[PDB]
Amino acid sequence: TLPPFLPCELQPHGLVNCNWLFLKSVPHFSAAAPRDNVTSLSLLSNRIHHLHDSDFAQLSNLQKLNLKWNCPPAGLSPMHFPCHMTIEPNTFLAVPTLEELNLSYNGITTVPALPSSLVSLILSRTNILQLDPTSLTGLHALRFLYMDGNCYYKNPCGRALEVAPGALLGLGNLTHLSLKYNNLTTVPRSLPPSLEYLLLSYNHIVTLAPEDLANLTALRVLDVGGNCRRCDHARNPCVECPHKFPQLHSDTFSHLSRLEGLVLKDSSLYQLNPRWFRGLGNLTVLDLSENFLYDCITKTKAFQGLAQLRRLNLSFNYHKKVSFAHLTLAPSFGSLLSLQELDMHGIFFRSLSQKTLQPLARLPMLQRLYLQMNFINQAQLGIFKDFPGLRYIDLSDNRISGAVESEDFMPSCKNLSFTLDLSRNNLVTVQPEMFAQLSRLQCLRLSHNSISQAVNGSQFVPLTSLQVLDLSHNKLDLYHGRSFTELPRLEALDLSYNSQPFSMRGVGHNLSFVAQLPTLRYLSLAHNGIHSRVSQQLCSTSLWALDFSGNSLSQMWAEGDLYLRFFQGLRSLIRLDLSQNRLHTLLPCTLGNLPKSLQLLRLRNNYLAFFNWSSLTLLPNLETLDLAGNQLKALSNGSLPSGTQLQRLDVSRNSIIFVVPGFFALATRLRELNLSANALRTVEPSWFGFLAGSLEVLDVSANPLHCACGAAFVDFLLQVQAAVPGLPSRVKCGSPGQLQGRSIFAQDLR
DNA sequence: AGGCGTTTTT
DNA sequence: GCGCAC
Numbered sequence: 001t002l003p004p005f006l007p008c009e010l011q012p013h014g015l016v017n018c019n020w021l022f023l024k025s026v027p028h029f030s031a032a033a034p035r036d037n038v039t040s041l042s043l044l045s046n047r048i049h050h051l052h053d054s055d056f057a058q059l060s061n062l063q064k065l066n067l068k069w070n071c072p073p074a075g076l077s078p079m080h081f082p083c084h085m086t087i088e089p090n091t092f093l094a095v096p097t098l099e100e101l102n103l104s105y106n107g108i109t110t111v112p113a114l115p116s117s118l119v120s121l122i123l124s125r126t127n128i129l130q131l132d133p134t135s136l137t138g139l140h141a142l143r144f145l146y147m148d149g150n151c152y153y154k155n156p157c158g159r160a161l162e163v164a165p166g167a168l169l170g171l172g173n174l175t176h177l178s179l180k181y182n183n184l185t186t187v188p189r190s191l192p193p194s195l196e197y198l199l200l201s202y203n204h205i206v207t208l209a210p211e212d213l214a215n216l217t218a219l220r221v222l223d224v225g226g227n228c229r230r231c232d233h234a235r236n237p238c239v240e241c242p243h244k245f246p247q248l249h250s251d252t253f254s255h256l257s258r259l260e261g262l263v264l265k266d267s268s269l270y271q272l273n274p275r276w277f278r279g280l281g282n283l284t285v286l287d288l289s290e291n292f293l294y295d296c297i298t299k300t301k302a303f304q305g306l307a308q309l310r311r312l313n314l315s316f317n318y319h320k321k322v323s324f325a326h327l328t329l330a331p332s333f334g335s336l337l338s339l340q341e342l343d344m345h346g347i348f349f350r351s352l353s354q355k356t357l358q359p360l361a362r363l364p365m366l367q368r369l370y371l372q373m374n375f376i377n378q379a380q381l382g383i384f385k386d387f388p389g390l391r392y393i394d395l396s397d398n399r400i401s402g403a404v405e406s407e408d409f410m411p412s413c414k415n416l417s418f419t420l421d422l423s424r425n426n427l428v429t430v431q432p433e434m435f436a437q438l439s440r441l442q443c444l445r446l447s448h449n450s451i452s453q454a455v456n457g458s459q460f461v462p463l464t465s466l467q468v469l470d471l472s473h474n475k476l477d478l479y480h481g482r483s484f485t486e487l488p489r490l491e492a493l494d495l496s497y498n499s500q501p502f503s504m505r506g507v508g509h510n511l512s513f514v515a516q517l518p519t520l521r522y523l524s525l526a527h528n529g530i531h532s533r534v535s536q537q538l539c540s541t542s543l544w545a546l547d548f549s550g551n552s553l554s555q556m557w558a559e560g561d562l563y564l565r566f567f568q569g570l571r572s573l574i575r576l577d578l579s580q581n582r583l584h585t586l587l588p589c590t591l592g593n594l595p596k597s598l599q600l601l602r603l604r605n606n607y608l609a610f611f612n613w614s615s616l617t618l619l620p621n622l623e624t625l626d627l628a629g630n631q632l633k634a635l636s637n638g639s640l641p642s643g644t645q646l647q648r649l650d651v652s653r654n655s656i657i658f659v660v661p662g663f664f665a666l667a668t669r670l671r672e673l674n675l676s677a678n679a680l681r682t683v684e685p686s687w688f689g690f691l692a693g694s695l696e697v698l699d700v701s702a703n704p705l706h707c708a709c710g711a712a713f714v715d716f717l718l719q720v721q722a723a724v725p726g727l728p729s730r731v732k733c734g735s736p737g738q739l740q741g742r743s744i745f746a747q748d749l750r
Numbered sequence: 751a752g753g754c755g756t757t758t759t760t
Numbered sequence: 761g762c763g764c765a766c
């Protein structure tokens with residue numbers, strides 16, 4: 001029988017998802033559907049312009065309703081089409097259980113009547129230009145009001161949004177208010193004392209005083225950034241902050257003892273008034289980005305009081321048209337004993353020395369340090385030795401060049417104890433000297449440099465704890481036999497996109513160093529265009545995973561018997577990616593020379609038009625096989641052979657016209673199968689023997705199915721619907737006539 | 751007339 | 761197949 005909520009899709013935790021179905025009105029759903037197991041209803045980005053009383057009446061246990069992007073104002077319409085949305089006055093009253101509503105990106109000019117149950121209301125990017133107490137009548141349970149972007153460059157109005165004095169006082173539970181991008185010039189008078197988060201960024205509130213935040217002693221977060229902007233850093237349309245502005249009175253934040261988060265970004269500040277931070281001893285996050293505090297951070301004592309502060313953002317506090325030769329942080333940074341995260345990216349300074357970060361050197365909790373995009377050309381990396389609790393340094397996108405004068409295939413550094421990112425720098429060789437005091441390092445990123453060195457075993461000698469080394473997007477010449485052997489703990493090495501040496505026609509290269517890395521588990525030689533004149537075998541007893549994608553095994557395996565055993569010496573290998581290797585053909589003899597230990601084999605985006613399925617028995621441990629993106633015209637020439645351990649099979653984006661009967665039958669372990677984007681005109685239960693019920697995923701979307709009245713496929717997909725993703729909307733007909741390009745349920749086939 | 755379309759959400 | 765060395 002049918003999916004219960006056609007054309008929408010029943011998802012977990014009682015969600016009915018009608019997203020992106022181009023609906024003109026809300027679907028009703030027959031009484032046969034369990035409309036009370038329905039706890040949430042999503043109608044994102046349809047084209048419903050008219051909302052009725054009956055539309056939600058029958059969904060009597062509905063808690064969440066998303067109606068976003070259905071009727072976008074002209075400025076947000078991708079083609080500037082106007083749209084007004086009519087709501088019948090009992091539309092939402094008929095859902096007395098409603099808790100969260102999203103009416104954002106919809107042309108409405110007044111708030112509709114809403115049930116008292118409502119805990120959350122989002123009215124952002126609407127055309128509502130006024131809020132007064134009649135707007136939000138009887139919403140005493142309401143805790144969240146979000147109404148950003150009702151008057152700005154993308155949704156203009158010609159005036160300020162008008163929140164009348166005391167308009168929201170009726171809302172006794174209101175903790176979260178947001179009114180960003182509304183062209184406000186003053187804070188709204190008399191907001192509920194219950195407010196905990198108040199967000200007024202990207203308005204034009206140029207003056208503040210303690211009157212402007214009267215009675216808001218519950219505030220835990222206050223965002224007032226972007227009201228007086230520096231447009232030299234603006235990516236969007238921007239009005240430059242007037243001269244003699246902004247004016248923030250000293251004691252503006254004095255009565256906010258509970259304040260945890262203060263955002264003052266992009267406020268054109270040349271000087272921090274320390275009186276701003278008096279009485280803010282409970283402050284944990286302070287954002288001062290995109291201001292002009294480049295001098296003030298070498299001098300100020302305004303941080304002295306902030307004992308509990310954890311995150312400090314000083315990024316893009318850069319002087320117009322200049323980078324500094326030197327930057328020395330203030331002594332008062334040394335009293336931030338709680339500090340975990342410091343962002344100094346985009347200040348622009350040329351030198352990083354002991355003096356630069358001296359005050360931070362004895363802070364016990366300092367873990368993450370962002371110094372990227374600073375045009376730094378000299379860096380004494382040895383300063384980080386004495387930092388007690390450091391876990392992460394981002395020094396990427398700098399001009400440092402030396403010492404001073406898919407998680408299956410490559411693991412991330414996220415859970416390691418000490419990571420240095422030096423990517424997007426100007427190293428052309430690696431000097432041991434620059435790492436002299438970094439023997440604690442577990443992860444080093446040096447990608448997107450200009451390293452064009454024949455590494456030999458002498459470059460990374462100090463790094464005796466290093467487990468991950470990323471050298472992707474460089475020009476390494478792999479030639480000497482002992483490259484990387486100075487790293488006793490190396491488990492993951494990325495040498496991808498170092499293609500240029502391998503392009504050098506008539507000059508060969510040496511991969512025999514892989515045998516000399518006894519602890520290595522992960523290796524990417526991906527996107528190197530390896531095609532000729534290389535070692536005939538990779539040899540390693542430790543290696544579990546090898547990305548060899550983006551090379552030309554094609555040309556290698558065409559070259560007599562030289563490279564037929566290339567991957568055979570990888571005795572423990574469990575994952576191999578041979579994708580985009582230009583393979584037009586495979587011998588069964590080539591596949592059997594891959595390691596017996598293999599569990600995962602990718603051959604994506606090759607040019608294979610034929611695959612001898614019987615040779616899968618030569619890889620007895622194979623659980624996953626990816627042939628996506630090849631040119632198979634059929635699943636045939638044998639079946640999946642007996643006793644095969646295969647669980648995941650992807651033959652998507654081929655040109656498969658048919659499947660032989662009983663093709664999958666002997667693959668009893670098969671759980672996930674992707675037949676998407678092929679030329680299948682039908683889906684038969686006879687492909688699966690009659691053991692298809694074990695399948696957890698069967699993707700048959702984007703296939704030119706023959707939707708002839710009474711077709712055998714229709715019935716089959718309903719018997720295994722739990723396993724077919726997107727069945728209600730995305731499995732479509734290629735024929736006949738007017739059904740082409742429309743869902744299989746666009747007319748009843750039975 | 752309405753169309754357009756996967757466009758952070760906080 | 762990239763200063764080794766009948």
Ligand SMILES: *[C@@H]1O[C@H](CO)[C@@H](O[C@@H]2O[C@H](CO)[C@@H](O)[C@H](O)[C@H]2NC(C)=O)[C@H](O)[C@H]1NC(C)=O
Nearest residue numbers: 628629650652653674675676677697699702725
């Ligand atoms: C089955 O394969 C298809 C097509 O190869 C997958 O659809 C692609 O999904 C990726 C991300 O997973 C997207 O970047 C592409 O845009 C999609 N391509 C097409 C042509 O639709 C699909 O996700 C796979 N199904 C499952 C269940 O994993």
Ligand SMILES: *[C@@H]1O[C@H](CO)[C@@H](O)[C@H](O)[C@H]1NC(C)=O
Nearest residue numbers: 117140141142170171172173
């Ligand atoms: C907050 O709403 C709840 C209903 O969920 C109610 O108990 C309480 O009266 C409300 N508080 C105020 C101050 O209105």
Ligand SMILES: *[C@@H]1O[C@H](CO)[C@@H](O)[C@H](O)[C@H]1NC(C)=O
Nearest residue numbers: 152153156157158159160183
């Ligand atoms: C913002 O406010 C003023 C009202 O004085 C108006 O002139 C201006 O056009 C408004 N801006 C936008 C983007 O609507």
Ligand SMILES: *[C@@H]1O[C@H](CO)[C@@H](O)[C@H](O)[C@H]1NC(C)=O
Nearest residue numbers: 166189190191211213214215
């Ligand atoms: C602040 O609170 C006092 C005491 O309850 C009240 O009388 C006063 O009107 C309030 N001020 C504002 C601006 O809401």
Ligand SMILES: *[C@@H]1O[C@H](CO)[C@@H](O)[C@H](O)[C@H]1NC(C)=O
Nearest residue numbers: 455456457458459480482486
């Ligand atoms: C590596 O090459 C350097 C030149 O940079 C040379 O001095 C050194 O002896 C070689 N080291 C090893 C371990 O082969």
Ligand SMILES: *[C@@H]1O[C@H](CO)[C@@H](O)[C@H](O)[C@H]1NC(C)=O
Nearest residue numbers: 479480481482510511512513
């Ligand atoms: C490749 O490197 C190994 C390890 O030093 C070396 O023995 C072998 O001779 C090299 N191959 C060539 C062709 O130079």
Ligand SMILES: *[C@@H]1O[C@H](CO)[C@@H](O)[C@H](O)[C@H]1NC(C)=O
Nearest residue numbers: 588612613614615636637638
């Ligand atoms: C697959 O290879 C085997 C072993 O060499 C061979 O017997 C068989 O004919 C091949 N299958 C097809 C369909 O050509």
Ligand SMILES: *[C@@H]1O[C@H](CO)[C@@H](O)[C@H](O)[C@H]1NC(C)=O
Nearest residue numbers: 610633634635636637638658
């Ligand atoms: C393989 O099957 C295809 C598709 O039906 C067929 O055209 C071809 O002749 C078959 N070849 C072998 C060797 O089985």
